[PDB]
Amino acid sequence: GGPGSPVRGPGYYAPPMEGEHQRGYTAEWRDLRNPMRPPEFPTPWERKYRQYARGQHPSYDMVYAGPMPEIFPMRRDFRKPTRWDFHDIEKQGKYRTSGPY
Amino acid sequence: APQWDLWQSRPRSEDMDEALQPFMDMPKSLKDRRYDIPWWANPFGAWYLQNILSLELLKLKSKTNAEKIATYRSYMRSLASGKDNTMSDDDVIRNIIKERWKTLEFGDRNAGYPCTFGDYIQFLNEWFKSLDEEGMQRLREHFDRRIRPLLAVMSPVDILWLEALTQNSPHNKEQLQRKIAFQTSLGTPEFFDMSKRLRYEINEDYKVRDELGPELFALWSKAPERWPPERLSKMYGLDFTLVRKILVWHHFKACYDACVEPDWSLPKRLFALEWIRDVRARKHGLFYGKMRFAEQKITFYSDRFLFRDLVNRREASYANVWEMDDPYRFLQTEQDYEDYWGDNYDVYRRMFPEMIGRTGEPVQQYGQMPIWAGPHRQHANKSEHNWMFAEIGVNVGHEALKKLELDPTNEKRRRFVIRQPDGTLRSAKMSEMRAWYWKEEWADFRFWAPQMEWGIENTPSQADFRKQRRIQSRPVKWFYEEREVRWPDVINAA
Amino acid sequence: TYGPHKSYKYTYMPDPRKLAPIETTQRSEIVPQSIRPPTSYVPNHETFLERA
Amino acid sequence: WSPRDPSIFHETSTRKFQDHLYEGEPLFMQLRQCPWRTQAKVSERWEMDEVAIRYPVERHSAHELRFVQAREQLLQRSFDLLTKLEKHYGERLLLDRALLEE
Amino acid sequence: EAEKHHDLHMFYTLAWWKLGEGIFGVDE
Amino acid sequence: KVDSFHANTQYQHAWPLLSHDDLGNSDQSNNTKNIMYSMYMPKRNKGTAPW
Amino acid sequence: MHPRLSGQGVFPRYGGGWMHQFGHVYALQQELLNAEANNWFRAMELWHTARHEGVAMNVSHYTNILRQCVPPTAWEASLMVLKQMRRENIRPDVVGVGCALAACADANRSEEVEKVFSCF
Amino acid sequence: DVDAEGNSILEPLAVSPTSTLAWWEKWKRETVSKHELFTEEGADGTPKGETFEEKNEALRMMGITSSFQTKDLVPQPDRQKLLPLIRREEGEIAGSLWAMDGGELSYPKDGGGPQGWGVRLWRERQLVKREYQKVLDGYRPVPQLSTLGNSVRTAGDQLDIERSGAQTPGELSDY
Amino acid sequence: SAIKRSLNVGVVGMGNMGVPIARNLGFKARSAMYLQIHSRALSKAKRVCDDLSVDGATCAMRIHDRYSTMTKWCDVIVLALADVKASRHALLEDNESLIMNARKGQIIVDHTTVDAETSRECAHEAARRGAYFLDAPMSGSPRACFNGQLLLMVGGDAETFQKMLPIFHMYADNVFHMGESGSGTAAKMISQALVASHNAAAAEALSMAHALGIEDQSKLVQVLDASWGSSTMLRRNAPLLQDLIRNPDKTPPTSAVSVDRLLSDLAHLDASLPKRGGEDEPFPVFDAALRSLAAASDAGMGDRDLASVVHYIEAGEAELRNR
Amino acid sequence: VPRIYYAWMRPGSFTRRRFEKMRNPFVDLETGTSLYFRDTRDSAEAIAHAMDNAIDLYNEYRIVPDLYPEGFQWKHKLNTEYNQWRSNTWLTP
Amino acid sequence: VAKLQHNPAPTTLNFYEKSFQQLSDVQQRQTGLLIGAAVGDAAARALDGYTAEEVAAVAAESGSLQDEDEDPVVFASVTPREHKSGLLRHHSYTFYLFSQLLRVMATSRGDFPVQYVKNEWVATARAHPDCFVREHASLLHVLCITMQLPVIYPWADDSTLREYASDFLEFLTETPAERAVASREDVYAYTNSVLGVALRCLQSNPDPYRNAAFMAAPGTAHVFPDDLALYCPPAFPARLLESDVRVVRECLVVARGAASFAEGIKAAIHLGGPVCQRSLIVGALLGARMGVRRIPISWLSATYDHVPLVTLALQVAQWSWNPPHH
Amino acid sequence: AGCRINLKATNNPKSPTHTVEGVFEAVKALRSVSEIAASRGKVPHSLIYNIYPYLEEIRRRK
């Protein structure tokens, strides 16, 4: 990533790494897309959050409110100028259309 | 008048839509030539008077009615046995009625026949026109119960043959008799016998509705705490959905058959979860889909601790939560009940995913800092609009920390503020605070926290910055005034 | 009723905020617009304008 | 702003007071200004407290006393206005003059 | 335009009494 | 005349309570017939969809 | 004069951790299951408060209630507790029944001890 | 008919007392209360009212005698095997079973075509024909004699059926 | 006792000035009416309901095609048809007419401008039935209905008028209680006569301006407005009148309020004025306006705007010559 | 071709069955459908080759493997059954 | 069911009307104690010094009433005798001293030492010397001030609440001249019994008065009704402690018998005497007993300092369940 | 399922039999989970489904 990027290694595979670099890339670096546990805290306060750091949200019966997807015609881009959207910087940008539905 | 029962029909307006295709095809001249006649003066009507006088006989129990009973008993005793007629004197009338219905034929009135196909068709057309919406619904119910079985079993050739019989025209009957295909394919009474089973199933469904609806309606309206829909369905053998739909339909027909508008809250109350799920609005030509999971997350079968957490949450959770349960005890006033359940119910159920006893947060107010300009500038800050400000920076605006950042108990809340168009400074309401984060569209209709288990598995156990924070909060008026503070020593009273 | 669903108040299920009322208030409610009378320096509007 | 208008129904229409929720906006009210008081030959503003809304705990007798005291000020103000209007047109407008004595 | 279901009524022009034995009356 | 011409060509009557999907699948009644249609949609969208 | 413990990191995950709308529930539950509590009047009043507040109570709450009644021998309160458990079909524990029997025996209510040692 | 300010206000006209809605509201009003209905709750933690005996006692206390005294009299739409089969394939047969105000009808379109009465009745005929083939093959019990079937009966077997009990063709064969 | 309920209000006509009333009631009901929408054409009624629903109402709506259902459902009815003949058909003449079939306490209001005798008969037979009838002729354009600015001249029981004020104030700004049993119809008759007279006067005045050689029509209107004589009718018709005079061959536009509308309204005045024995001719300028409007209607221009009188003043004078 | 074409037209689906019904109003859904997406345009020939029995627009493409190759052979009764599948114009046992 | 708005009816009557719906079941009583105390004191203010016969005379004189116009006593329009300034125009000195403790508690966010408010109270006393001498070391004054404390933690045992309140009672009973008091222990015991009564009231107790009598301090049978006094453990100020105990006894009796907040407050005022204190005690007990949603919203809007005071009560209620310092 | 065929390595990529032959060859080579699990000596669902006690079945017997 270089100067401003926090990313430290490629997403999935990389060249062979040695010592602390291999240890970090394999185990210790932040993996923020993990679905079972979030990134791990230092030693004295990982133990006391061990049983909060599993899963995502305790309810597995969540009734989906909100709009239903459109399957025909399928749109490619949903980009419109908006006046009161304070999340437009994030609403922009390509994202993967892969989810539960 | 005031009764307007079936003997003296309510007068109707002209230009009314005709019930049958040939009467949509009426020439207007012939429409006008039609004369306004009572119902019994119709040939078919008069014959039906001859048929229904026995229905009068079974009730109006006059001396003349007893004499007619005697005469009809004598006529019916033509049966060799006679004992069956003797025991059936209470219901010999239905035997004559069945035989009279059988012996009906269409021809010329002036001839030996009672009425023609045209008169019968006119009677049907106008009888239908004389029906209100309730009457039309009852007619369609009769069709469902009686004709659909026979019509479904019967072949199109059989229906055309019956049409020929009704028209009673010798020439067309002879043509059909000439046609070979019409002769061969009619005689399937063994197949037709399925019609009674079909009729029995349709009638038992209608019976479920019309007879088992009022009973469970009364029970659920009396004590919904005692007999809620799930217990009702389990103990009556019916479906959960069918019982709820029966209740809704009965209430709405009670409202519609009167002239009282229905309470739209009932489908929402009996289908809260389904109302949130399946009740979106749609546009033309978009073919919307269905979402099966609210979110993408790891399944609970993948870990022993996720499995235990789900089991504990389910035990602490309801299975079907109704308008009477604990989570709705905050609707202490009838107006609260009505406003929550009538409209904006989607808003209220979406304000928070989890189920709590608040559906929102209380608002409060802040003091305006002293304006040393004074009344020269007291007019400012009053506008035509509500101005909302939400805090940002580090330590604020993180989705992962949303529930902690807008928690009233947190020393570091996000500090939203609303200035009203009258200059008042107030805090934000839970929905306004929640509108500054990413959308969260889901609900939990069965977990109710207060019924969590405790004392078996859930037995929770256990620098001067806190002192400095208490100092910050503490009042500091003593700075202006071990020389301990004492009450004033009164001097004027000495 | 007009809609196919004899069970729904609104057949098209509009967002419950589509129906939320919009109140209003004028700047006149807050502050008035007084008019400062002409002075001997600018007795009339033409003098005001030529001075401007 | 009805959604039946194809220009208001489009996703990028600004004839709305919101976004992502619905299209258009049902009947709503807004108040314009009418700066034409001064077009009139005699314009005046009368300062009187509200009387038509009852205070949270007031009793009917006091709520009526407020109406009475406001009636007194309305009477005096109308008398002054009629005097100045008489000087303006020059005619006689206090034709009755039966109430001011009391 | 919603149909008014006039075929319901057209199906009544037949002589269902011939087969049903008073089919237009109450159920026994 | 403009209002007479501008008819409702845009909206459709809402979904009944227990209505099916446009593909015919349903929840709590139609099980193991329900199909997943998240893989037919385009891989990427140039702006987050309402869902 | 404060909830014994209330905040982040002290309550089970499956409940959603700490929901601030149920702080009263959590404090009431901790006071109900307070093992150091020895005021049987306080126990009865807390059971009534929990009854009103609709917090589900297990057999351990009743066990604590009964345990608080032995030293003073409020055998009648113990019998009322047992009656309420019979009414609600909450099966008492061996230790809870033993506490009731101890209260009655030390109160010399031999008739009541005989009756209790016939239902269980 | 008077608001706080004292002026008159619109009052909705009273509903007909003979209406079912009026009877329901009246019955809710003067009938007995919910808390007087049962004195003690079920034996095991559960409120009384599951068993048909408790249900009937409660209904009598409420002033109505149940038409379904025992579990055997209430119908059960699980047993019906032909109606569900026909419903699943082409649509509901008891159209107007859930109708209100003349809407929510599930009947075929009046325009004779690929979606009309002729085709719908032909397909229903096919399904009932399939079930009749099942009856012939012996998987299903033989149906009883029907009025529509009785209406043909060689024109002479009707007399035999009438002189006999003759509920089933097997009964007629034994006769 | 009764049951808490939302009063049922129905709207019958739905012509040009009928559907705006229903739209205003639907927007401003706030879930207190359960509005009813009657029309001879159920397609028309359903179209009104669908457009109102997609635009967004605050009340439920019920479509009606025949008067019996309206009678039995509605607690209050408002009827705004095109012609007095249709008003009679709906109110009294039809077999299932409302007044002839009115329930105890029901309320009926008519906005169509009908004859004094028609209103008298309607109110009398409603009183016989036990219901209440208010004759409430209205003035204002469909634009004014959309803006909620209509005049209503209600004649009937003060009790029912006071009770119905909340419903009137949803589509009518200026609502007056002229009295009872035809007072509103008399007021509307007088207003229509005055409108006709003032329209004729304005047309003649602008013709005078053109003849004398004034082409600054806006400035003339400003002078008149600030001056001692100026009519709302002149302010309304001034631009069109100049546009139409300056190019005499130009055909007048068509408007909702037309020469035939004025003539039908004034026929009721011609019927209701007294002194038939003395041949009832004491009103010369009113007669002259009637003459000019009749000439305009006979010229095939009866469906156009009231400003068409300019091209037919001299035609009316020629007809007078023919006497 | 739409992007959801395969989900729409997957054999045995609700939408595919509805399409088959609307293409031939009186098929037998259990056997009257087609496995493939190919639009062979011989529907006119199928209706021509096609009393009051179901029509299979894909009959010339269908092969019902004849069960019962052996067993009892009654002389007084044929080896065929009534209500038996109609062969194609080329199919042979 | 929504009526036609022929007049511009207000959507909501009071600012906090809808905010009180968003409070938990216990929080409603937690807030109701404070709000009802304020409402009762503000209702009693206009008739603070009036004797029983004089309040009866006021009721007789104000004899014009509509259907439900109002009762002349609750917010009587009678001209008061003593001209005051600031908050004393609408509240008694006891409630003036009460509100400062409410504010200190709100900003403190839970239990706190008494030194946080010692100086506020002392400044109030220096500001109003006459009321300080008239109401200091009085049983009614001390108890009226001290009813607040339980809302810091609605369910705490009697021992915990009494040890917590010992400091406030120490400072409120300490003399300015260090000369003497009638009986510090008797005042503390009588205050503790009624404080336990209030704790029971917002504990949703079945019979708060009976259970508080059972657990009352030894030798404090007189404050309780003679009916409940049958079972109670045996053993400076201008007014006498016996008079104060009697007055508290009638106020607690009317609180017991009250059928609703307004009826109880009117009954409390009709007795006259120290009406502000009587109505404040009755209002606190009734607000703790039945929630704040039962307080007349018009009375809450009529009280002078409702807009700051309700916010303070909301802060205390929602902070009492998770003090940051614990 | 999903299938992709590359024919650019054949002498005549335009031939018609190639695609069908390739699809049928791939289907022949494909093995079922039942066969795989039977050949390995374990249940079929443990190779497809995420249930946490399946972790014990990939370890050896001890």
Q: B289 and A35 in contact by Cβ < 8 A?
A: no
Q: Which two tokens stand for residue B66?
A: 């007893």
H or E stretch covering I77: strand I76-79
Paired strand residues for A63: B443
Q: Answer yes or no: do C11 and F13 touch at CB < 8 A.
A: yes
Q: In the block, which residue shows the tokens 């030798």?
A: K219
Q: Is the peptide bond before B450 cis (omega within 30 degrees of 0)?
A: no
Count of C-beta atoms within a 10 Å radius of residue K45: 23
Using an 8 Å Cβ cutoff, are H10 and I134 in contact? no
Tell me whether residue B193 is exposed, middle or buried, using C-beta atoms within 10 angstroms of its C-beta: 0 to 12, 13 to 18, 19 or more: buried
Return the SS3 of I304: strand
Q: Check if I254 contacts H (Cβ < 8 Å).
A: no
| CB-based contact, E21 to chain H, within 8 Å | yes
Encoding tokens for residue K182? 């009638």
Largest distance between two CA atoms of chain J: 60
Residue of chain I nearest B255, judged by CA positions = I5
F7 touches chain D (CB under 8 A): yes
Q: What spatial distance separates the first Cα and last Cα of chain L, rounded to whole Å?
A: 39
Contacts of I25 (CB under 8 A, 6+ apart): I9, I11, I33, I35, I59, I167, I170, I171
What is the count of residue pairs from A and F with beta carbons less than 8 Å apart? 67
Side-chain half-sphere exposure of J93, counting CA atoms within 13 A: 8
Residues of chain B neighbouring L51 (CB-CB closer than 8 A): 301-302
On whether the CB atoms of residues K24 and B357 are closer than 8 A, the answer is yes
Separation CA A38–CA G11 (nearest Å) = 19
Question: Which uninterrupted H or E stretch holds F45?
Answer: strand F44-45
* CB contact burial K190-225 (16+ within 10 A = b; e otherwise): bbbbbbbbbbbbbbbbeebbbbbbebbbeebbebbb
Does an interface of 3+ CB pairs under 8 Å exist between B and C? Answer: yes
Q: If DSSP codes are grouped into helix, strand and coil, which group holds residue B389?
A: strand
Query: Chain F residue with minimal CA distance to D19?
Result: F50
Residue B420 backbone class (left: φ over 0; alpha: ψ -120 to 50; beta: rest): beta
Q: How far apart are CA K193 and CA K245, in angstroms?
A: 11
CB contacts < 8 A, C to I, total 28
Question: Residue D75 in contact with residue D63, Cβ under 8 Å?
Answer: no
CB I312 within 8 A of CB I244: no
Chain I residues with CB inside 8 Å of C19's CB? 56-58
CA distance B357 to B330: 6
Burial class for K84, CB neighbours closer than 10 Å (0-12, 13-18, 19+): middle
Would you call H103 and C7 a contact, using CB atoms and an 8 Å cutoff?
A: no
Q: Which residue of J has its CA nearest to A71?
A: J4
- B 336-395 near A (Cβ less than 8 A): 349-350, 353
User: In 10 A of CB I152, how many CB atoms?
Assistant: 27
What is d(CA J41, CA J45) in angstroms, rounded to the nearest whole number?
A: 9
Assigned token pair, K249: 């006894």
Hey, is the C-beta of B358 within 8 angstroms of any chain G C-beta? yes
H126 CB neighbours in chain J (<8 A) are 26, 28, 54
Q: Which of B345, G20, B414 is nearest to K23 (CA)?
A: G20
Residue K14 makes CB contacts below 8 A (sequence gap 6+) with K297, K300, K301, K306
- Subunits with 3+ C-beta pairs closer than 8 A to H: B, C, E, G, I, J, K
> What region does I279 belong to: left with phi over 0, alpha with psi -120 to 50, or beta?
left
CB A94 within 8 A of CB F44: yes
Window 26-65 of J, Cβ < 8 Å to F: none
- How near does any CA of chain C get to the CA of F43, in Å? 30
Nearest to J22 among H114, H122, H123 (CB): H114
Single-letter residue type at I238: A
Report the C-alpha gap between B429 and K18 in whole angstroms.
11
What is the sign, positive or negative, of the torsion defined by CA atoms of B266, B268, B272, B273? positive
Q: Is G6 annotated as a binding residue?
A: yes
Q: At what angle do helices K93-108 and K306-319 cross, to 10 degrees?
A: 40
Contact F40 A101 (CB under 8 A): no
**Residue type for position K54:** E
CA distance D61 to chain C (A): 30
Residues 6+ apart with CB under 8 A from I152: I111, I136, I137, I138, I168, I172, I174, I175, I176, I184
Tell me the C-alpha to C-alpha distance, in Å, between residue I143 and each of B369, F2, I56, I152, I172. Answer: 49, 14, 19, 16, 12
Contact H119 J25 (CB under 8 A): yes
Asked if residues K90 and K42 have their Cβ atoms less than 8 Å apart, the reply is: yes
Q: Chain F contacts of B279, Cβ < 8 Å?
A: 14-15, 17
Task: Please provide the DSSP assignment of chain D as one string.
Answer: --TTSHHHHSTT----SSSSS-SS--S---------GGGSSS---------SS--TT--HHHHHHHHHHHHHHHHHHHHHHHHHHHHHH-S-------STT-
Phi and psi angles of residue D25, each rounded to the nearest 5 degrees, phi first: -160, 125
Give the best residue of H104, H105, H106 to mutate against chain C (max C CB count within 10 A).
H104
**Would you call J51 an interface residue with chain B, using a CB distance cutoff of 8 Å?**
yes
> Three-class SS of residue K287?
helix
Chain E residues near residue H105 by CB distance under 8 angstroms: 5
Main-chain dihedrals φ then ψ at residue G17, nearest 5 degrees? 70, -125
HSE-CB of I265 using CA atoms within 13 angstroms: 25
The secondary structure of K202-233 as a DSSP string is TTT-SSHHHHHHHTSPTT--TTS-TTTTTS--
Q: How far apart are CA K142 and CA K148, in angstroms?
A: 11
Is B315 in the A-facing interface, judged by CB distances under 8 Å? no
> For residue I133, is it left (φ>0), alpha (ψ between -120 and 50) or beta?
beta
* CB < 8 Å to D5, chain F: 6
Between helix K275-289 and helix K25-44 the angle, nearest 10°, is 160
B-chain residue closest to K307, CA distance: B365
Q: Which of K2, K5, K6 sits opposite I31 (nearest CB)?
A: K2
Distances (CA, A) of J8 to H164, J5, J19, J20, J34: 57, 5, 9, 12, 14
Shortest distance between the Cα of I120 and any Cα of chain D, in A, equals 37
- Tokens matching residue K225: 């009704």
Residues of I in contact with K8 (CB under 8 A): none
Q: How distant is the alpha carbon of residue H141 from its chain centre? A: 23
Could K3 and H9 be called an inter-chain contact, meaning their C-beta atoms sit closer than 8 Å? yes
CB D21 within 8 A of CB C18: yes
Those chains having 3 or more beta-carbon pairs within 8 angstroms of chain A are B, D, F, G, J
* Closest to K44 (Cα-Cα) out of K286, K225, K275, K292: K275
Of J4, J14, J18, Cβ closest to residue F37: J4
- Residue K170 CB-half CA count within 13 A: 10
Say which amino acid occupies K312.
L
Alpha helices in chain F (DSSP H): 2-5
Shortest distance, CA B243 to any CA of chain F (angstroms)? 14
**Which amino acid type is present at position K92?**
S
Give per-residue burial for H94-111: e unless 16+ CB within 10 Å, then b: bbbbbbbbbebbebbebe
Chain B: give the shortest CA distance to residue E1, in Å. Answer: 15
* Number of Cβ pairs < 8 A linking chain C and chain F: 17
| Sign of the four-CA dihedral H163, H164, H168, H173 | negative
- Cβ separation C12–I54 shorter than 8 A: yes
Q: Looking at chain H, which residue has its C-alpha nearest residue C5?
A: H104
Alpha carbon dihedral J72, J73, J74, J79, in 10-degree steps, equals: 120
Cβ-count burial B94-132 (b if 16+ within 10 Å, e if not)? beebbebbeebebeeeeeeebbbbebbbbbbbbbbeeee
CA distance to partner chain B, nearest, from residue C3 (Å): 13
Q: Which helix (H) or strand (E) holds G41?
A: helix G40-53
Pairing of strands I9-11, I107-110: unpaired
Picking from D3, D24, D27, the nearest residue to I27 by CB comes out as: D27
Contact H143/B194 with Cβ under 8 angstroms? Answer: yes
Other Cβ atoms within 10 Å of H167 Cβ, number? 11
Q: Give SS3 for B283.
A: strand
Measured in angstroms, the CA of H109 and the nearest CA of chain C are apart by 15
Kindly determine whether residue G21 and residue B358, on different chains, have CB atoms separated by under 8 Å: yes
- Which residues in chain H have Cβ-Cβ distances shorter than 8 Å to I166? 9-10
